[PDB]
Amino acid sequence: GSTRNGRDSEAKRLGVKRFGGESVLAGSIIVRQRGTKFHAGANVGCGRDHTLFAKADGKVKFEVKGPKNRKFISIEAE
Amino acid sequence: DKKSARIRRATRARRKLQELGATRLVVHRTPRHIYAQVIAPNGSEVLVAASTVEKAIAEQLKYTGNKDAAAAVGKAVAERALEKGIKDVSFDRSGFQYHGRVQALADAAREAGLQF
Amino acid sequence: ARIAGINIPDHKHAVIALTSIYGVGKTRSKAILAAAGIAEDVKISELSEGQIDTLRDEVAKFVVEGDLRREISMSIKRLMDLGCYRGLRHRRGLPVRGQRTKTNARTRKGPRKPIKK
Amino acid sequence: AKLHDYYKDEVVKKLMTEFNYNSVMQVPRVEKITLNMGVGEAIADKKLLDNAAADLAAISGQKPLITKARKSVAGFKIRQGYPIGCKVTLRGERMWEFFERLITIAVPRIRDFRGLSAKSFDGRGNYSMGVREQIIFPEIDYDKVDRVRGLDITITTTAKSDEEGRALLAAFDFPFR
Amino acid sequence: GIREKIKLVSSAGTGHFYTTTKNKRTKPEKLELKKFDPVVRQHVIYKEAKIK
Amino acid sequence: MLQPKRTKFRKMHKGRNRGLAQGTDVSFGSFGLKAVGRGRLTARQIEAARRAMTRAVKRQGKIWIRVFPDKPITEKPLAVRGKGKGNVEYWVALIQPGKVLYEMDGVPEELAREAFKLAAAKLPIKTTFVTKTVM
RNA sequence: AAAGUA
RNA sequence: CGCGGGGUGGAGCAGCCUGGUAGCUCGUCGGGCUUACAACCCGAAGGUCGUCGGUUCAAAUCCGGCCCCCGCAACCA
RNA sequence: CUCCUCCUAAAGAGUAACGGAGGAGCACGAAGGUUGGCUAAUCCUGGUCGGACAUCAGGAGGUUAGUGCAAUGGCAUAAGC
Ligand SMILES: [K+]
Ligand SMILES: [K+]
Ligand SMILES: [K+]
Ligand SMILES: [K+]
Ligand SMILES: [K+]
Ligand SMILES: [Mg+2]
Ligand SMILES: [Mg+2]
Ligand SMILES: [Mg+2]
Ligand SMILES: [Mg+2]
Ligand SMILES: [Mg+2]
Ligand SMILES: [Mg+2]
Ligand SMILES: [Mg+2]
Ligand SMILES: [Mg+2]
Ligand SMILES: [Mg+2]
Ligand SMILES: [Mg+2]
Ligand SMILES: [Mg+2]
Ligand SMILES: [Mg+2]
Ligand SMILES: [Mg+2]
Numbered sequence: 149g150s151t152r153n154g155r156d157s158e159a160k161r162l163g164v165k166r167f168g169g170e171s172v173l174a175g176s177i178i179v180r181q182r183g184t185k186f187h188a189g190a191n192v193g194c195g196r197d198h199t200l201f202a203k204a205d206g207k208v209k210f211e212v213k214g215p216k217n218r219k220f221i222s223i224e225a226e
Numbered sequence: 227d228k229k230s231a232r233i234r235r236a237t238r239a240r241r242k243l244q245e246l247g248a249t250r251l252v253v254h255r256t257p258r259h260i261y262a263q264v265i266a267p268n269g270s271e272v273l274v275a276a277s278t279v280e281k282a283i284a285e286q287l288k289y290t291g292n293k294d295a296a297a298a299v300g301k302a303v304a305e306r307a308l309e310k311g312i313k314d315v316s317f318d319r320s321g322f323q324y325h326g327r328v329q330a331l332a333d334a335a336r337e338a339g340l341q342f
Numbered sequence: 343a344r345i346a347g348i349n350i351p352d353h354k355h356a357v358i359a360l361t362s363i364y365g366v367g368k369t370r371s372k373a374i375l376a377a378a379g380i381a382e383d384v385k386i387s388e389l390s391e392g393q394i395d396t397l398r399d400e401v402a403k404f405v406v407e408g409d410l411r412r413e414i415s416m417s418i419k420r421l422m423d424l425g426c427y428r429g430l431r432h433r434r435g436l437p438v439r440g441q442r443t444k445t446n447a448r449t450r451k452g453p454r455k456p457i458k459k
Numbered sequence: 460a461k462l463h464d465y466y467k468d469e470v471v472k473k474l475m476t477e478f479n480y481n482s483v484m485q486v487p488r489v490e491k492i493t494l495n496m497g498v499g500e501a502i503a504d505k506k507l508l509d510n511a512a513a514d515l516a517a518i519s520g521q522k523p524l525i526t527k528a529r530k531s532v533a534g535f536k537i538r539q540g541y542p543i544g545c546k547v548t549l550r551g552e553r554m555w556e557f558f559e560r561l562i563t564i565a566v567p568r569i570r571d572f573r574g575l576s577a578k579s580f581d582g583r584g585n586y587s588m589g590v591r592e593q594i595i596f597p598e599i600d601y602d603k604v605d606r607v608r609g610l611d612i613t614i615t616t617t618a619k620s621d622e623e624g625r626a627l628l629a630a631f632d633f634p635f636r
Numbered sequence: 637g638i639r640e641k642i643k644l645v646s647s648a649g650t651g652h653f654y655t656t657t658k659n660k661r662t663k664p665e666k667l668e669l670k671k672f673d674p675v676v677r678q679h680v681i682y683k684e685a686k687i688k
Numbered sequence: 689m690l691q692p693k694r695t696k697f698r699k700m701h702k703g704r705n706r707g708l709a710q711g712t713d714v715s716f717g718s719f720g721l722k723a724v725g726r727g728r729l730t731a732r733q734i735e736a737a738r739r740a741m742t743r744a745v746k747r748q749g750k751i752w753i754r755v756f757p758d759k760p761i762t763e764k765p766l767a768v769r770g771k772g773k774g775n776v777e778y779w780v781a782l783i784q785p786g787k788v789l790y791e792m793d794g795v796p797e798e799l800a801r802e803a804f805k806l807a808a809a810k811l812p813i814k815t816t817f818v819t820k821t822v823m
Numbered sequence: 824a825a826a827g828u829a
Numbered sequence: 830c831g832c833g834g835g836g837u838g839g840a841g842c843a844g845c846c847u848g849g850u851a852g853c854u855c856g857u858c859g860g861g862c863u864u865a866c867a868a869c870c871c872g873a874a875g876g877u878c879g880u881c882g883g884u885u886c887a888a889a890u891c892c893g894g895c896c897c898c899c900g901c902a903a904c905c906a
Numbered sequence: 907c908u909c910c911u912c913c914u915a916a917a918g919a920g921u922a923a924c925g926g927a928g929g930a931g932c933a934c935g936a937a938g939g940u941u942g943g944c945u946a947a948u949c950c951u952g953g954u955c956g957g958a959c960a961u962c963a964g965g966a967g968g969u970u971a972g973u974g975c976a977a978u979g980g981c982a983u984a985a986g987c
Binding site for chain 4: 950951952953954955956957958959960961962963964965
Binding site: 697698700770771773 | 925
């Protein structure tokens with residue numbers, strides 16, 4: 149006999165690229181994600197594939213804010 | 227609920243203004259009165275304010291809940307803001323339509339000198 | 343052209359038009375017209391309202407339309423729940439006035455029902 | 460307007476004495492009257508919906524709104540978005556005039572009429588009734604009708620229960636049985 | 637793959653064209669859009685034509 | 689023979705069987721048969737023990753089965769070499785020490801002990817007789 | 824032109 | 830076991846592909862022609878499509894199992 | 907036999923097998939941009955034809971809906987209408 153399985157897709161290398169406290173340059177990707185598990189905070193942008201990236205030089209900061217206890221990433225100016 | 231509906235209506239623009247770090251000119255309208263505040267970018271400090279519940283403004287109006295009162299409040303808030311030296315704000319309609327009394331207030335503030 | 347809660351034809355003679363009421367036949371229609379003082383051969387289209395209103399109370403003198411239907415239904419229901427011979431005939435849909443059932447009786451029995459196998 | 464004045468000038472005090480309300484704002488009010496036609500045969504001939512809408516417009520003195528299917532239903536061969544009804548919402552003066560017309564003219568002209576059911580309340584003081592034939596409304600000419608058509612009438616009331624709803628309706632001499 | 641390629645040709649006479657696709661069975665009407673012509677450096681009308 | 693009426697998936701990874709059990713108290717009856725060992729209980733075993741118990745008490749009292757065979761087990765047929773996972777052949781419950789497997793009520797303790805001994809003789813895992821505790 | 828049986 | 834094709838009025842066979850009640854012939858039933866039967870003529874009825882699940886607003890139909898049947902293949906040492 | 911989604915995969919990434927399960931080889935000039943507005947499923951009760959299920963009204967409920975098409979991650983400030 150044979151199997152009807154045997155397929156998969158290539159790994160997409162998502163996840164956090166710069167962790168809390170890391171110094172980054174403007175433009176740096178901070179996290180790659182499907183949809184907004186993390187949300188964009190101060191000095192952070194959200195791209196068309198929901199990548200969060202730095203809009204200014206500084207240090208990465210994660211926090212939980214708002215009425216829904218959501219996770220936000222911001223850049224602290226250094 | 228009307229109030230919750232209006233708050234939902236206003237949230238997107240308010241979050242955009244906070245992200246932009248703008249100084250807000252927030253308007254609040256009731257059937258009897260209209261109010262205006264100029265709020266610092268942190269969202270928790272009021273720089274200037276003017277409304278029809280103030281005696282100095284309400285004493286010169288036949289009725290505090292119409293377009294003439296709205297224009298008076300807009301002019302007063304713009305004059306006080308210019309006296310404080312602000313000159314640059316973003317209008318926050320707070321979920322009310324940009325129309326009627328709200329629009330008359332905004333037009334009066336623009337005429338008096340606020341840039342928005 | 344509105345008597346006893348229904349609409350009567352306007353292009354017909356009064357005597358013919360009145361029979362459209364449930365509970366009014368030719369004889370009762372003739373009696374009602376005689377009581378109202380209206381000719382039988384006059385179309386109700388050319389009748390003034392002052393004649394329709396005098397026809398209406400004459401019609402109301404009788405038991406017609408919904409009242410008559412309720413009365414007939416009540417009498418048949420009384421037979422059925424009494425369970426006499428006539429009531430059983432009404433229950434089973436067979437003729438109730440002693441007609442033959444070996445043949446005929448199609449009005450009471452409906453169309454023919456062929457035997458299955 | 461006549462029935463509105465009648466309400467404000469007798470019904471308020473009648474209901475206040477009957478139910479011992481502490482405020483006039485507690486008195487049940489007639490919020491709205493909604494007329495509906497479920498024209499499920501328009502899927503075969505949409506012109507039937509047009510005729511039904513014309514009849515509703517004649518009856519209520521208002522332009523009706525065509526209502527579409529909320530979802531596809533296999534049982535009735537309708538897809539989502541199919542226009543299958545028409546409704547009219549009456550408030551204020553139009554509501555009061557229609558209420559007066561319905562109470563004093565149309566309801567007595569109902570075939571074999573013997574009073575409206577007092578159990579046609581939804582539990583929160585709103586009333587619903589069904590008119591089998593539109594010809595009871597004098598605005599509809601019996602000679603020009605191409606097809607008999609019924610409708611549903613709902614009176615939505617600010618009452619809190621069926622007893623208060625029926626008291627308010629009976630204060631207008633509603634023809635209950 | 638029923639959609640066919642088409643070009644949108646500048647009305648400014650420059651020869652500039654954009655390309656896109658179209659469902660020709662459902663929308664037989666010609667596509668017409670205002671788009672930027674980089675030759676004359678203005679937005680102008682562009683009209684559908686065959687792909688080549 | 690217990691077996692899920694339906695399942696999300698037909699086949700399951702082998703997995704492992706570490707830890708102590710949850711559900712170590714007589715919770716429904718007065719007496720219980722508790723596992724002391726670790727292992728798998730097939731649906732056939734569960735049912736063989738149930739039969740032994742029930743006939744011992746003459747269908748008096750009440751009996752609960754606290755375990756359910758929800759894990760499918762596949763086998764490869766004879767004379768087959770790979771080529772995909774084998775076919776589901778039976779169903780098991782994973783058992784850890786401390787698991788109460790059956791409970792009884794409405795019978796004397798001596799009879800319950802006898803019935804449970806007859807049942808344990810059908811099972812591949814060591815067991816012990818337990819009684820309800822107040823706390 | 825087509826007419827089998829008892 | 831592997832690869833295919835199937836299962837639909839009493840029988841043989843369409844429709845299935847491509848989602849919106851399914852047909853033909855023989856057969857059966859009632860009537861007619863005949864002294865009677867056959868042949869012949871007229872009229873009528875009879876299946877929710879092998880069994881379950883899933884998708885779907887909707888399944889004879891698409892998908893996934895299960896049962897029965899048919900045809901190939903199941904080999905080198 | 908190329909591509910996508912989950913699991914295996916051992917809480918960063920990556921990670922094999924003729925391992926376990928499903929999909930793609932498009933669609934859309936609006937189903938794209940923006941401004942303004944809006945909020946679901948399901949059930950209960952009352953209501954002409956109307957029925958288990960059509961449209962109407964009220965209530966409960968709170969996203970159990972929705973997303974052009976798999977699955978995962980998302981989505982109310984909606985990315986849903
Ligand atoms: K007889
Ligand atoms: K005869
Ligand atoms: K109410
Ligand atoms: K993983
Ligand atoms: K758009
Ligand atoms: Mg993957
Ligand atoms: Mg008569
Ligand atoms: Mg493990
Ligand atoms: Mg465990
Ligand atoms: Mg012979
Ligand atoms: Mg050879
Ligand atoms: Mg990992
Ligand atoms: Mg790891
Ligand atoms: Mg490696
Ligand atoms: Mg490797
Ligand atoms: Mg692999
Ligand atoms: Mg494939
Ligand atoms: Mg918007």
